[PDB]
Amino acid sequence: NGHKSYKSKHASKGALKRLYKKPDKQVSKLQRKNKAKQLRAQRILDSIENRKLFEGKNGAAKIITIVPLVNDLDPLDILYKLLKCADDEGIMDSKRIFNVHIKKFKSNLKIIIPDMTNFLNILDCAKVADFVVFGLSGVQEVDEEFGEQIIRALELQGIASYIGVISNLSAVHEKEKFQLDVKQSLESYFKHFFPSEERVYNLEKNSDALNVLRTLCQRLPRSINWRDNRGYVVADFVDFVESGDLVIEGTVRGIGFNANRLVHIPDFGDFQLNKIEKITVFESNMNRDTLDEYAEEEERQLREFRDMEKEDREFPDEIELEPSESAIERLKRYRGLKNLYNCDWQVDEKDPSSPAEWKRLLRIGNYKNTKNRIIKETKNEAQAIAGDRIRMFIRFPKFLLEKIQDPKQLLFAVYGLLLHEHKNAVVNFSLQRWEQYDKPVPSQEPIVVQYGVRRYTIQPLFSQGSNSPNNVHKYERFLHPDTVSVATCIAPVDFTQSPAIFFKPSPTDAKNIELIGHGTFLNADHSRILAKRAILTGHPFRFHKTVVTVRYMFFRPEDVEWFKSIPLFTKSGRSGFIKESLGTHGYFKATFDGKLSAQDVVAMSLYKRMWPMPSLPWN
RNA sequence: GGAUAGUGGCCUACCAUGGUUUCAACGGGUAACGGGGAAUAAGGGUUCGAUUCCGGAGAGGGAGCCUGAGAAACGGCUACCA
RNA sequence: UUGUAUUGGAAUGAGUACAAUGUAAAUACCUUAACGAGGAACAAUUGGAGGGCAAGUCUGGUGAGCAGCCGCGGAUUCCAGCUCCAAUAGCGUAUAUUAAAGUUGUUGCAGUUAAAAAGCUCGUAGUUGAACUUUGGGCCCGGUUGGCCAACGGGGCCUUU
RNA sequence: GGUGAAAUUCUUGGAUUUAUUGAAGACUAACUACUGCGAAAGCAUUUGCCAAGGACGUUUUCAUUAAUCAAGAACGAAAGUUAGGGGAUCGAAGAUGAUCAGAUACCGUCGUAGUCUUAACCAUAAACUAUGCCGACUAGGGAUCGGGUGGUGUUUUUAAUGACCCACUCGGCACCUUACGAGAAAUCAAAGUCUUUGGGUUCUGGGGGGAGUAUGGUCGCAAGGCUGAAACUUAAAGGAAUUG
């Protein structure tokens, strides 16, 4: 324009015309104060609503579990020293589950003791507790091969709350300052796993043991997310009726139960309940979901994986052809692509190696908007709720009766399923290695995975994590030595994103188990296409100002012609293309972005579709 | 005139029409107990003081009262509200 | 007489402990017989290395990370290893406040063109308001400080008082 | 007739043009400027009446009666509102002609309200010298407006007066040169007498947006005027000057 324009601190009316196309309240001191008071009334009423569940003998019991980390201890010493401070000897037998009422704190406690021989039974016991009491020895320090693995495993499945306890520190008395030196060491060790806690009690002192007892009675535990969104109960008694109709009585602790649900027992699988009653009766009204799943030579094997993984780490996906081998018949299935992130590979491809189940598989899409929606309905439909004394009748196959034990001697526990979780789908897991598991893991090798209560034998497929616009990703032969990774298989879905633990059975080990890794249920996503990449390679050997010719990549003129269209690249990063076959031995000549030399190598990439394998329960 | 340990609209009867204010009355706000003091050093200032000493107020919220030289007391009593 | 590496005697408390002392009784400090260092493993951390702002043309990887601000990266600024810098039994971060700040200005800001002189004049409260009345000159006493003397202070009398 | 070109329109009952006369309403050319007056808005034909004002002259009179100013008050271009008058010209709205053409690219005909005036309202402008009022001091020069003093000066005549010339002086609108001074620079006789910081006094500002918005109040018949936030967002926005 060329003119110094007009200025004003606020817009002129001329400017506004071109651009074109209840009372406020003062808070008086009284009403300020009044609002704060009536807000506090809500908070206080809300705190009562939480606590009523534990309020007394009429309320629910709190579930305590004792876990000694050293066999030196004997768990009966732990419990006995606690019971003394209750100051009622009427409290203080051929059994490992105990119900106690404490007059001193008007509190109901259930104590469960696991059988320390059965490592897997420890996890199952601790999985249901509100409080886990860790026993430590002042005399002998925990062993890395067993004692620590208890702590590490419990953390990764999740713990409602934890207490550190000592019971025998006087066994190293000279002066109690020497006891304090040891106690400081144990606290520093314990805090490494549980940095929220800074105290370990000495039960040899009356003041500490009373302090522990008070806490168990008075304080509330944390919730466990994946558990409390389901229902669960612990059996007070079990009974059998005629193929069976197994009866359990106990207390509701989760979100709740409905007689039309499905019920999982961790050792035995899914079963249907037929009736419920409250200690009114509820019956399975047949407008219900149903039980349908659809609609020394080993040294050579270990050495093989050790050698193969070392090779794959140096020269990944490189392949050797051989003379008298047809490249077509070997490789015709491979499509060949410029870039996985840009290819239009179809998900539910019709190729014959695709599993027989496809329409048979459940597919969800928006897992997030599915998960939260399902829960909202489930909590509304609950019939029995926390603290209800209940009986339940369950369709129980009579031949499994040989596996039942008296619940007074062994933990028997019951979990409700979410509706579609019985159906199989494509599922995805995060995975990273256990604390020092340096062994090679082959992508096809079978593994046992626990996630939530249930556990399955799985053969995975490994891939790296990224957000490709098409969900196509490279299949990988072995688990990366360091990064987190994504593993894919077919299994029954979980909506709660339970933590997952990865291990392999090994009865040669003291705990019968070898621990491999941990992770999380990410999602069901069938679009998570895996492509098996292959690299062929050949040697450029003669060089001209406009073309280079390459040996050994192919051995027949017919093969050079059939694969002519796939682009070439150098590992030094130049691209190129086949011109034509030269001669009968399968030489070719090619053009590239620039100068090559015999110190470079010429490669080409090809890709094949992969599909997940199915999986089966484990016990 | 009554009442009080005692002065005084402190209260009662009768009578007069006064009292404060742009030198900011009256009203509203304070995550406001006051002071000795604390931090920050060119000088002038700015910000803070629930808290070891001095003074005031209260004992879940309002009101009433016995004993005693002294209390409108709450590790004294009586009633209502929660 | 100063640096860089194989080798030798000396020195000591952290810690433990007989005893005495301490204390209402004790613990600890102060004192002390015995024991107590060679990778003296009896092993010091917390943040940084483009500029503001002390200190890397080092070297390997990569093409999500860093960054109060300016900026780096499709690599002196990312990640890893060497080396180097700063404070050190302490060092970093968040929020509030003070100084540097003459961005609240009494001391001490600014208003043509950068934020800011009201269209114009009258006028009450408020702030502010020309000059003038005993001035000068004598004579005693006189304290302090430094060389009878000088300076600087103070009291009395006379002159129309 | 009108345009870049053309059409609507008027005309052989005579258009446009020429001559002799008359009516109405508005306006005050040239003279007219680096000139005058007024608190500002603003003010231009002649003569009469009414009342007011600055500067100058003064050996008149009173004797501190003064300067600035919250509240309160008078005036306030153009457009706009209500009622009466007037109604030439031009002309928001409205009704109409062409829709072709790149310089003439938005043009032609008719025409309501309005434009003027009387009696009441409204209170805005780039209302600008973009510079608050009162008082003192600091530099050179030749022009001009109003008053006064002097001259043995020219002219109107044989005085006075008037016109002109020369010197001085009070007051005013401006201009040219310079910078002891000042400033970011353009520039400035004040925008000087400031880190060497104090003559009196009124008003306003505190990075850019949200915003002259929301809400409350108050004035107006209405259009609208005055007063006037915060949550949130952002690293610049802005001034002067030269140059690739």
Swiss-Prot record:
Q: Which gene encodes it?
A: TSR1
Positions of the UniProt region annotated as Disordered: 1-35
GO molecular function terms listed in the Swiss-Prot or TrEMBL record: GTP binding; GTPase activity; ribonucleoprotein complex binding; U3 snoRNA binding
Q: Where in the cell is it found?
A: Cytoplasm; Nucleus, Nucleolus
Task: Write down any Gene Ontology CC term.
Answer: nucleolus
Bias class Basic residues marks the residues at 1-21
One Pfam family, please name it: Tsr1_G-like
Subunit structure of this entry? Interacts with RIO2.
Keyword annotations:
Cytoplasm, Nucleus, Ribosome biogenesis
In terms of one coarse class, where is the protein primarily found? cytoplasm
Q: What else is known?
A: Present with 1390 molecules/cell in log phase SD medium.
Q: What taxonomic lineage is listed for the species of origin?
A: Eukaryota, Fungi, Dikarya, Ascomycota, Saccharomycotina
The record, for PANTHER family, names: PRE-RRNA-PROCESSING PROTEIN TSR1 HOMOLOG, RIBOSOME BIOGENESIS PROTEIN
* Organism encoding this protein: Saccharomyces cerevisiae (strain ATCC 204508 / S288c)
Function, as annotated, reads: Required for 40S ribosomal subunit synthesis. Required for normal export of the pre-40S particles from the nucleus to the cytoplasm. Its subcellular location and association with pre-40S subunitshifts from mixed cytoplasm/nucleus to all nuclear in RPS19 disruptions, suggesting it acts after the ribosomal protein.
- Where do the Bms1-type G domain residues begin and end? 60-222
SMART domains (alphabetical): AARP2CN (SM00785), DUF663 (SM01362)
Q: What is this protein called?
A: Ribosome biogenesis protein TSR1
Q: Which family does it belong to?
A: Belongs to the TRAFAC class translation factor GTPase superfamily. Bms1-like GTPase family. TSR1 subfamily.
